[PDB]
Design a protein around this motif. Structure first.
Motif, PDB file in Angstrom:
ATOM      1  N   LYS A 265       0.783   5.515  -0.643  1.00 28.58           N
ATOM      2  CA  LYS A 265       0.254   6.689  -0.859  1.00 28.58           C
ATOM      3  C   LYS A 265       1.164   7.706  -1.624  1.00 28.58           C
ATOM      4  O   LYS A 265       2.123   7.858  -1.320  1.00 28.58           O
ATOM      5  CB  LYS A 265      -0.388   7.484   0.429  1.00 28.58           C
ATOM      6  CG  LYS A 265       0.666   7.576   1.649  1.00 28.58           C
ATOM      7  CD  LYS A 265       0.066   8.048   2.816  1.00 28.58           C
ATOM      8  CE  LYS A 265       1.198   8.176   3.747  1.00 28.58           C
ATOM      9  NZ  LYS A 265       1.945   6.961   4.055  1.00 28.58           N
TER      10      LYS A 265
ATOM     11  N   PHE B 174       0.802  -1.222  -0.013  1.00 31.73           N
ATOM     12  CA  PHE B 174      -0.036   0.106   0.023  1.00 31.73           C
ATOM     13  C   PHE B 174       0.738   1.170   0.031  1.00 31.73           C
ATOM     14  O   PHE B 174       1.766   1.621   0.825  1.00 31.73           O
ATOM     15  CB  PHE B 174      -0.967  -0.099   1.289  1.00 31.73           C
ATOM     16  CG  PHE B 174      -1.596   1.255   1.556  1.00 31.73           C
ATOM     17  CD1 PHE B 174      -2.709   1.617   1.110  1.00 31.73           C
ATOM     18  CD2 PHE B 174      -1.150   2.092   2.685  1.00 31.73           C
ATOM     19  CE1 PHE B 174      -3.305   2.745   1.204  1.00 31.73           C
ATOM     20  CE2 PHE B 174      -1.645   3.046   2.786  1.00 31.73           C
ATOM     21  CZ  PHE B 174      -2.805   3.597   2.186  1.00 31.73           C
TER      22      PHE B 174
ATOM     23  N   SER C 285      -3.901  10.040  -3.014  1.00 34.25           N
ATOM     24  CA  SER C 285      -4.518   8.836  -3.483  1.00 34.25           C
ATOM     25  C   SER C 285      -3.836   7.418  -3.269  1.00 34.25           C
ATOM     26  O   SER C 285      -2.749   7.878  -2.347  1.00 34.25           O
ATOM     27  CB  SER C 285      -4.673   8.791  -4.998  1.00 34.25           C
ATOM     28  OG  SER C 285      -3.603   8.281  -5.544  1.00 34.25           O
ATOM     29  N   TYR C 286      -4.163   6.398  -3.312  1.00 39.89           N
ATOM     30  CA  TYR C 286      -3.800   5.392  -2.740  1.00 39.89           C
ATOM     31  C   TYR C 286      -3.303   4.390  -4.136  1.00 39.89           C
ATOM     32  O   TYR C 286      -3.793   4.384  -4.947  1.00 39.89           O
ATOM     33  CB  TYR C 286      -4.230   4.565  -1.826  1.00 39.89           C
ATOM     34  CG  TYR C 286      -4.914   5.360  -0.802  1.00 39.89           C
ATOM     35  CD1 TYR C 286      -3.987   6.077   0.012  1.00 39.89           C
ATOM     36  CD2 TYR C 286      -6.409   5.688  -0.618  1.00 39.89           C
ATOM     37  CE1 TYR C 286      -4.456   6.862   0.903  1.00 39.89           C
ATOM     38  CE2 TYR C 286      -6.719   6.647   0.247  1.00 39.89           C
ATOM     39  CZ  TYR C 286      -5.905   7.134   1.098  1.00 39.89           C
ATOM     40  OH  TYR C 286      -6.255   7.873   2.074  1.00 39.89           O
TER      41      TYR C 286
ATOM     42  N   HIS D 213      -6.122   3.961  -7.052  1.00 45.88           N
ATOM     43  CA  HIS D 213      -7.295   4.096  -6.209  1.00 45.88           C
ATOM     44  C   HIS D 213      -7.565   5.296  -5.505  1.00 45.88           C
ATOM     45  O   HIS D 213      -6.799   5.866  -4.994  1.00 45.88           O
ATOM     46  CB  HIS D 213      -7.268   2.678  -5.242  1.00 45.88           C
ATOM     47  CG  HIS D 213      -6.893   1.502  -5.725  1.00 45.88           C
ATOM     48  ND1 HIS D 213      -7.642   0.644  -6.211  1.00 45.88           N
ATOM     49  CD2 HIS D 213      -5.502   0.860  -5.693  1.00 45.88           C
ATOM     50  CE1 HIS D 213      -7.204  -0.462  -6.294  1.00 45.88           C
ATOM     51  NE2 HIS D 213      -5.621  -0.273  -6.296  1.00 45.88           N
ATOM     52  N   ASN D 214      -8.828   5.627  -5.320  1.00 45.19           N
ATOM     53  CA  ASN D 214      -9.150   7.044  -5.219  1.00 45.19           C
ATOM     54  C   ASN D 214      -9.269   7.034  -3.672  1.00 45.19           C
ATOM     55  O   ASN D 214      -8.579   7.959  -3.010  1.00 45.19           O
ATOM     56  CB  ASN D 214     -10.554   7.377  -5.781  1.00 45.19           C
ATOM     57  CG  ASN D 214     -10.501   7.154  -7.155  1.00 45.19           C
ATOM     58  OD1 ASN D 214     -11.106   6.386  -7.490  1.00 45.19           O
ATOM     59  ND2 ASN D 214      -9.453   7.577  -8.142  1.00 45.19           N
ATOM     60  N   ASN D 215     -10.104   6.319  -2.768  1.00 45.95           N
ATOM     61  CA  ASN D 215     -10.220   6.465  -1.827  1.00 45.95           C
ATOM     62  C   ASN D 215      -9.767   5.492  -0.746  1.00 45.95           C
ATOM     63  O   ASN D 215      -9.350   4.591  -1.112  1.00 45.95           O
ATOM     64  CB  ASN D 215     -12.131   6.904  -1.265  1.00 45.95           C
ATOM     65  CG  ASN D 215     -12.744   5.856  -2.133  1.00 45.95           C
ATOM     66  OD1 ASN D 215     -12.053   5.254  -3.300  1.00 45.95           O
ATOM     67  ND2 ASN D 215     -13.863   5.784  -2.115  1.00 45.95           N
ATOM     68  N   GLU D 216      -9.923   5.641   0.797  1.00 45.98           N
ATOM     69  CA  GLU D 216      -9.433   4.664   1.500  1.00 45.98           C
ATOM     70  C   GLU D 216     -10.073   3.531   1.431  1.00 45.98           C
ATOM     71  O   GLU D 216      -9.476   2.340   1.435  1.00 45.98           O
ATOM     72  CB  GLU D 216      -9.698   5.085   2.978  1.00 45.98           C
ATOM     73  CG  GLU D 216      -8.839   6.090   3.566  1.00 45.98           C
ATOM     74  CD  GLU D 216      -9.026   6.745   5.174  1.00 45.98           C
ATOM     75  OE1 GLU D 216     -10.229   6.659   5.510  1.00 45.98           O
ATOM     76  OE2 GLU D 216      -8.211   7.145   5.637  1.00 45.98           O
ATOM     77  N   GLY D 217     -11.387   3.349   0.990  1.00 43.63           N
ATOM     78  CA  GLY D 217     -12.321   1.901   0.986  1.00 43.63           C
ATOM     79  C   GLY D 217     -12.243   1.405  -0.455  1.00 43.63           C
ATOM     80  O   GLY D 217     -12.721   0.149  -0.525  1.00 43.63           O
ATOM     81  N   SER D 218     -11.130   1.867  -1.322  1.00 41.79           N
ATOM     82  CA  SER D 218     -11.002   1.264  -2.833  1.00 41.79           C
ATOM     83  C   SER D 218      -9.715   0.555  -2.653  1.00 41.79           C
ATOM     84  O   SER D 218      -9.665  -0.230  -3.692  1.00 41.79           O
ATOM     85  CB  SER D 218     -11.201   2.315  -3.792  1.00 41.79           C
ATOM     86  OG  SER D 218     -10.912   1.618  -5.226  1.00 41.79           O
ATOM     87  N   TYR D 219      -8.978   0.760  -1.686  1.00 38.22           N
ATOM     88  CA  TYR D 219      -7.740  -0.175  -1.718  1.00 38.22           C
ATOM     89  C   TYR D 219      -8.194  -1.395  -1.079  1.00 38.22           C
ATOM     90  O   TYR D 219      -7.911  -2.486  -1.583  1.00 38.22           O
ATOM     91  CB  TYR D 219      -6.655   0.507  -1.106  1.00 38.22           C
ATOM     92  CG  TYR D 219      -5.551  -0.331  -0.954  1.00 38.22           C
ATOM     93  CD1 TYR D 219      -4.643  -0.381  -2.021  1.00 38.22           C
ATOM     94  CD2 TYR D 219      -4.934  -1.079   0.102  1.00 38.22           C
ATOM     95  CE1 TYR D 219      -3.551  -1.103  -1.987  1.00 38.22           C
ATOM     96  CE2 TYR D 219      -3.875  -1.866   0.242  1.00 38.22           C
ATOM     97  CZ  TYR D 219      -2.962  -2.131  -0.957  1.00 38.22           C
ATOM     98  OH  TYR D 219      -1.995  -2.799  -0.917  1.00 38.22           O
ATOM     99  N   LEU D 220      -8.648  -1.445   0.083  1.00 40.23           N
ATOM    100  CA  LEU D 220      -8.800  -2.417   0.860  1.00 40.23           C
ATOM    101  C   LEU D 220     -10.287  -3.373   0.316  1.00 40.23           C
ATOM    102  O   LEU D 220     -10.360  -4.325   1.049  1.00 40.23           O
ATOM    103  CB  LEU D 220      -9.218  -2.042   2.362  1.00 40.23           C
ATOM    104  CG  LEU D 220     -10.091  -1.034   2.720  1.00 40.23           C
ATOM    105  CD1 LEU D 220     -11.568  -1.697   2.948  1.00 40.23           C
ATOM    106  CD2 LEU D 220      -9.419  -0.062   3.905  1.00 40.23           C
TER     107      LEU D 220
END
Ligand SMILES: [Zn+2]
Lengths: 208, 144, 78
Positions: B7, B5, B12-13, B22-29
């Protein structure tokens, strides 16, 4: 109809520039003449790629931004960094409390220093000539040295102190060059303590 | 503890092995599960999960031989014989100074693993087939 | 004939450092410096292409007297 790269290289007065695709054009002689016209710049490299010109810069991490020096000598980076790290500790209680009871004058630096740094200490940047386009790898091809000089970096790695005494400082290949001759490929190379004076020609060596 | 992971310079991630944005926190995980991440994890379990572990120190009987350890082990009830391995002191839960010796480690499922310090460089061979014996009926374990 | 083998290179050595070093002894056309691409690590050796055989042979003769990172550099015909 489309004659190959061979005959196109035979026909053009400068076959340096004719590439794989120019035989597949609709006017090859004109295109390779315009490719070899004088001060034009070539087409960008990514017209034939598959990666949308910069979507290969994915995983590499890069520094944020280096401010230019005349702006860094205003202290704005230090004040603004301290203010962001102070604001990063505030809860929403104090973030909406200092929205109606604001303490001002948090930076209030001066105007003579800013007007100095934009008018007195303005620095010409490092520009480039008009041919030098950009490709994706460009800023990491930075490798783009001469006989008779050795860099400080190479001298640390070699253990060769820069001094003027042409015989104790010299490169360790001195003795062999006295025995076997100067470089076959540098006829005009002059080496201090060989064919140049030891204390006079102290630049290690020179083409002369 | 994800080591891929990242940043980037604009908040972004990025998955680093997948090279994906991946845009947000929840779209990586929600990407760590998925056919792009799992197959790249394979290119770059069950028995380990179900190991019964009471952590009971058995009784060893070291003895200087010349030409050997005698571990009394209560019942396993499985076919798998107890297993030894030679391990270095370099990796440990506390990592403190003085690491630099080898341990002859012994294990069997329901119960605790046992270690024996070896300061000599070579004296014996810590191998399974060459030099171990398992008296499964009386439940004493052997190794020399 | 125009290419020499260079050995005993510390893996911290760069291709520009090899170029700077060997251009003191003759013009260098190119350097091939093999790299493990998985680990991004140089492998202790390089091939230095001079413009002709005479230049390369001259290099081999004068090139055994350099230490880089304390390691003596070997230069041989290939
Ligand atoms: Zn991934």
């Amino acid at each position: 109809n489309r004659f190959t790269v061979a005959e196109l290289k035979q026909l053009v007065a400068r076959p340096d520039v004719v590439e794989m695709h120019d035989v597949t054009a609709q006017d090859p002689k004109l295109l390779v003449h315009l490719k070899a016209t004088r001060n034009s710049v070539p087409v960008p490299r990514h017209w034939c790629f598959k990666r949308k010109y910069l979507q290969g810069k994915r995983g590499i991490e890069k520094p944020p931004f280096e401010l230019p020096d005349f702006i860094k000598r205003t202290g704005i980076q230090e004040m603004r960094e301290a203010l962001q790290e102070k604001e990063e500790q505030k809860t929403m209680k104090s973030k909406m409390r200092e929205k109606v009871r604001p303490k001002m004058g948090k930076i209030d630096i001066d105007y003579q220093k800013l007007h100095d740094a934009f008018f007195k200490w303005q620095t010409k940047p490092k520009l480039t000539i008009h041919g030098d386009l950009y490709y994706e790898g460009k800023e990491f091809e930075t490798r783009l040295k001469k006989p008779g000089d050795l860099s400080d970096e190479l001298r640390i790695s070699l253990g060769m102190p820069v001094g003027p005494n042409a015989h104790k400082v010299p490169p360790p290949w001195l003795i062999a060059m006295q025995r076997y001759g100067p470089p076959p490929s540098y006829p005009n190379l002059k080496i201090p303590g060989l064919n140049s004076p030891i204390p006079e020609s102290c630049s290690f060596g020179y083409h002369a | 503890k994800d080591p891929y992971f990242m940043k980037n310079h604009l908040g972004s991630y990025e998955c680093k092995l997948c090279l994906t944005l991946h845009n947000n926190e929840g779209s990586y995980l929600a990407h760590t599960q998925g056919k792009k991440h799992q197959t790249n994890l394979a290119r770059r379990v069950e028995v380990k999960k179900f190991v019964k572990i009471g952590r009971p120190g058995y009784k060893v009987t070291k003895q200087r031989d010349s030409e050997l350890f005698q571990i009394d082990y209560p019942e396993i009830a499985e076919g798998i014989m107890p297993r030894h391995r030679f391990m270095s002191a370099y990796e440990q839960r506390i990592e403190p100074p003085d690491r630099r010796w080898q341990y002859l480690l012994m294990a069997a499922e329901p119960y605790e693993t046992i270690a024996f310090k070896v300061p000599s460089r070579e004296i014996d061979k810590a191998e399974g087939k060459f030099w171990t014996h398992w008296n499964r009926e009386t439940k004493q374990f052997f190794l020399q | 004939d125009a290419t020499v083998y260079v050995g005993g290179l510390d893996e911290k050595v760069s291709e520009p450092l090899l170029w700077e070093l060997f251009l003191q002894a003759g013009p260098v056309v190119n350097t091939h410096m093999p790299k493990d691409r998985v680990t991004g690590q140089h492998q202790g050796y390089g091939f230095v292409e001079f413009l002709s055989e005479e230049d390369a042979d001259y290099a081999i003769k004068i090139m055994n007297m350099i230490k880089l990172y304390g390691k003596p550099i070997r230069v041989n015909k290939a």
